[PDB]
Hints:
part of a larger assembly, 9 chains, A: mainly alpha, F: mainly alpha, five-stranded parallel beta sheet, globular
Amino acid sequence: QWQEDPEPEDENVYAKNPDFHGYDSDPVVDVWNMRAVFFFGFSIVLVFGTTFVAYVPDYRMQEWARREAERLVKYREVNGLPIMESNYFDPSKIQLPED
Amino acid sequence: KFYVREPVNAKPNWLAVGLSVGASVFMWIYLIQTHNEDVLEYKRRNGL
Amino acid sequence: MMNGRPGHEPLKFLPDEARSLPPPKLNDPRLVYMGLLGYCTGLMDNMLRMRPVMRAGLHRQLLFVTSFVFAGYFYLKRQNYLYAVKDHDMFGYIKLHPEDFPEKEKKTYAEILEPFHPVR
Amino acid sequence: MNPITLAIIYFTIFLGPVITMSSTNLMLMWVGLEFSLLAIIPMLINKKNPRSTEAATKYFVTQATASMIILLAIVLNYKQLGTWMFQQQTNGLILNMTLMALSMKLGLAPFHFWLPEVTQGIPLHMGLILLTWQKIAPLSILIQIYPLLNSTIILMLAITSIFMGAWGGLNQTQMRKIMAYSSIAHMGWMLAILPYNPSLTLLNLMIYIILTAPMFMALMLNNSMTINSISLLWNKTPAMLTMISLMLLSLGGLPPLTGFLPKWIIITELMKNNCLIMATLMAMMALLNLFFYTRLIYSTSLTMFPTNNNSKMMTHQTKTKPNLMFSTLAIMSTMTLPLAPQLI
Amino acid sequence: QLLREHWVHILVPAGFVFGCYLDRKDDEKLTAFRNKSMLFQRELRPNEEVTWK
Amino acid sequence: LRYGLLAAILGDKTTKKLHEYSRVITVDGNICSGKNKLAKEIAQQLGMKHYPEAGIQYSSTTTGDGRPLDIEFSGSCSLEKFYDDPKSNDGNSYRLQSWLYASRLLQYADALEHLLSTGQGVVLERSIYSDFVFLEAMYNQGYIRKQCVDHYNEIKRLTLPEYLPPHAVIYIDVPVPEVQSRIQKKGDPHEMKVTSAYLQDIENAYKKTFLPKMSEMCEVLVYDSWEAEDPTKVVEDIEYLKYNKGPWLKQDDWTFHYLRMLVQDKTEVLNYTTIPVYLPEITIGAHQGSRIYNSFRELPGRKYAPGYNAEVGDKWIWLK
Amino acid sequence: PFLDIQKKLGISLDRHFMFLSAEQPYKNAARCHAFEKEWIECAHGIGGTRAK
Amino acid sequence: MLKIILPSLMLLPLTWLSSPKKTWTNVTSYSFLISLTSLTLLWQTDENYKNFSNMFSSDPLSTPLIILTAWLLPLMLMASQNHLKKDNNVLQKLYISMLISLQILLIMTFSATELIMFYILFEATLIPTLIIITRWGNQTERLNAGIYFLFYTLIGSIPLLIALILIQNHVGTLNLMILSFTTHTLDASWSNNLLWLACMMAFLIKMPLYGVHLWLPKAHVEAPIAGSMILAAILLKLGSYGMIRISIILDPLTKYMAYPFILLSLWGMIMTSSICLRQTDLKSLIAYSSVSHMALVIASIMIQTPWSFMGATMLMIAHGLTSSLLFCLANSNYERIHSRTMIMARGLQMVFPLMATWWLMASLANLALPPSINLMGELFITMSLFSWSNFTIILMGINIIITGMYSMYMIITTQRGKLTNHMINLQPSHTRELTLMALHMIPLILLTTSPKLITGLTM
Amino acid sequence: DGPEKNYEKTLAILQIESEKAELRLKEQEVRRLMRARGDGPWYQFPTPEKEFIDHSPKATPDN
Ligand SMILES: Nc1ncnc2c1ncn2[C@@H]1O[C@H](COP(=O)(O)OP(=O)(O)OP(=O)(O)O)[C@@H](O)[C@H]1O
């Protein structure tokens, strides 16, 4: 045979430090890693990011679009205009060819 | 611990230290003065 | 191709015309990148020779940084000069040969009829 | 070798190409090539074994014929025009014979059969010089006459070099032959573009040298000449695997490393002249050039092989061999792509 | 000032500050069309010198 | 200034250093024959230095603090386990044999580094030219599989011709019962349980192979016990040797130079021993090898090059 | 050339016997001296593609 | 963006200069903070997109991928913490450096303006992945897996370089804003159909198509975990992003050069989900599910409608989260049994009654649960395909059926049943690997609460 | 800051890259013309030196 070490058998953790969390062997490091994870991941990211994202105004110009739509249907139907004509541009400034 | 075979790099080579440091200093000095001279000549040729 | 350019000096790193170009800043991102390359060079030198890292050869590391920056300054100056020369000769040729580079006059999207390609 | 002899021989090696550059007469050009020839053989044959004798004989006998063919081209030009310079309005046969002989000198396919043999027959140094410094004057000839070469065999030879270098390095367990087939492929990339902005040929040359020299040093540090010998490097000197990996992945051109710049910009200037499908073939066989580098770097850096009992003595003792230029050349390769506009 | 095993906490904040400075430098570099776009093009207010910096 | 071509040109040549007793001299013999007691007095009388027999731990002693290391760093081998279990499946035998060949090889290299550097002579004992004896003994018994013999002889083929042989060899002979009783009166439970055919095959190997092929290049001085005692007579024989008939005569300053350079670098010395010939008795696997290498670089004095260890007490580390 | 070290220093190691109309040892004209001189004096300032 | 990728670079010295005992913690916390500061670029109060320089931009297609890439890093980093805990500290730190390099390069990809920047970065991503798969995989097939995963990509990507180079020589800029406003209709010749193929069959390999997917199971099955997270979460989406960017310069050829690929995607989606119905290996089951999902994204991008691009973005992000979650859930058992065979351990929910809820939610994400950004994507691309052709729902429905089947079968034959009483090594749980699943699922719930963000260029 | 910043910065970037495109194509056509005909500074391939001709009186008149 070729002189390798054998397989180290199945470790159990909770024998040593039964308050093990999943991070390290030192009981202090596990605590100050889980506190770090929980705090920095939940309490600031998943909270303040939700707040920031919820209090972003007019995301992609949505509320503005509704307000403009409202005033424009108002104007168009007050002044008897055809609401939302069937051609974006006017032929006043479009040149087609012949034949 | 205290080596049975005394190495080469036990004590420094203070010569190489001084040469390296003086060379770096001379490099930076020539660089800053050359930079000032080039800026001034750029402004002198291209006017202002 | 620019070797046969008239007045081209043979083996002249920085002709006197290049002194009319503006120099670099000395804070350029590429010169600090070269300093970073020198620092990593010293670090790798120490790693290869079974030495401490960020602790051992501070005179060597400083020398690496300075050599890299002090070379990159002049090499970048030369390259700036060469690209300046490129633009210079290109402008001169278009100005001498306008019949080949005519004053084109383009149209608007009202007069041209680009074809429609539905998705459907 | 005593010092007087080394001085003489290395001066001659340095002066061959230097005469070749700073000479307008093609005949002094030939003289420089012959100094490079003559002075190399002593150090090829220094260890005095049958492998070295065979390598030196093959080198000599292949390079002498190429030299005679170049001299024929030169003498035919002198008869035609009464000058010692390949002008325009020379004969394409003269120019093509010159190209053929120069390809035999470099080591390009289908004139490649001698380079891996010779390289295996000689130490790691004398492979470095043979693959880096001897390539510089023969390339200088072509660079000085680039608007006179036929753009057809220049590309067929490049394509053959690409294909054959890739396929040969696919199956070489010996490293001294891997380096040779890499040389063949990179000279192919050079020669393909040489009629098209020969500045890029010198770019690829400098990149190739800067990659190969530290690789040869890596092989020198433990006299590694085989995949199984370079695999015993996670024990002997394991601080080198990072640089070896990045250098191999630069050689087989991958983007974030500067060894992709020459292929990329070559493809650019070749697509600027409607040389499209040739560049496609070249770019698609560079992948096979990359495959055996990947196999190698598996074997040495990612899947650590079995070692021996006697390799612990190497761990007891200490080393001095890294010349402090391995670091600079390995880091200026593999990390200089963002400075590529200053390289071009 | 003993046993600074905690100075490394300045590297990432330093990176953030430096990145914000560089973005500031870039939008200083691109101060063209600053009030020349056909959409806004406002005349400067009585105490105004630049419109968005 | 590390030695090199520059030093040789400046004038640190070698032939200026040799005076008369600038001699590689090896004393050989069987397991207990009086080698150290004789070599020590030769070195005292003539002005050489004694280089004791290279065991499992010569690299450790000539490296670092110069202590013994745990047996998994200084090999994986035990001599006791060879005497009490010579036909193991665990290949302790050839592992030990090859480790000891490498240790004798480094020993000879250190010796030649000292000789050519200083001109001072060197007394060895049982050098790399006499290590095959124990291999042949093991292989005549069933203590080795033949592939290990090919491995050993290949490494020998690669390593031996690069070095110069000794000037003289001093093989002191003892019959097998005499050495066996001497072992009995030595005080070792493990050497006591060794056979007589092993010793007789050592003796046969010596007398048949090692003596004539070295008489083709060296001055042999075969003595016996009654002659091996009183080293002064052996010394007085060494003093009047005509050191002809060898390759030392055809050596220039530059041959000495390149030998001195090959010998100044122990990695080039031991490279051809670390070859990847994959015998199960010599291979140690990646997991175990990595564990050993890490645990070795986590020792005092190791983890960095010699001068660059502040945990020991080195200094000016930020300025080397 | 590749490295114009001669033009750098003004020397002429080889660039003065490049053709026939070039300093024969005693002033003996080579044949086609006039023709080569005239060709060369036409092809000066110009380079290559236009001189051809 | 610079304020996002400079701190990401500073995370590397933070690794190398910290203590061995205070390196996972610092880098994890600071990675969470990078993720936090990667929300400034969701401040889009307007229709015009966010250009910070000639280099960097950020559209509503870039930003979710950016945020997800910055957000995965802490999760990869904590999942990678049980294995390679007994590894030497330098080896740990090398793993960390590779993951951070992935983060940086992928952000640079999704933020890039030019296509060549995107190319060199899309290919630089190969080196960390290959190193992770090969040096830290547990089995011996990792080498062939790395070779496959590298060379499929390179084979596809060399033509991409050639086509980009052509486009530069033809137009001059290769920037995406200018190629948008200056795109000439194509003459519909073979010389342009080859261009279409060269531009597309690098991304289609990476997504992947069903004709070419053999790299993805071999890699997912053999990468340790974090490689699997990335390879399921954003490396596949790195092809969809590229298709959505590059298709604008290929009209009208996409109307007829897309039939083979839509068709391959649809039929091979059915084939892959049928494979998932019958597969001994759990880590392969997740992978074939990823193929069966990304095929819809292929077809959707080929159709090039607003609904379709939209649903593609939704499915991209949703699939990334839930697939990373499922790979974590399988790794949670693999760290104990050390077997990928699923029918080995089949009677959990006794010992792990809380992880068995994360399992359930991960599967319900996988199958079409309506209040979820998975079903929104799947439904909208189904509607796009029905508009395209009414006869595609016949295939999408078969997929829906099989996709309920294999997911519920996974849950049942892994959790439900009788406990394998011969497994004393089923340790209770890790707070770490519970927080993992929580951090994978809480985003899904939030994004379901507000999918206005998770749409793309078209909404 | 506001929308004007983004809008006008985009306009700046657009003029920059448009000008770059213009100049790249211009450089292509320039190199094409200079190489097809040596009217320009580039691609002026070397000719024999003029100053190394001997103009002195020879040994024969009809030199
Ligand atoms: N190459 C080898 N192979 C196997 N065993 C060896 C080898 N070399 C030495 N040994 C063992 O090491 C021991 C060394 O004893 P050695 O012959 O050196 O005695 P000594 O120390 O010289 O003094 P004395 O000869 O008086 O005992 C012996 O028992 C021998 O078997």
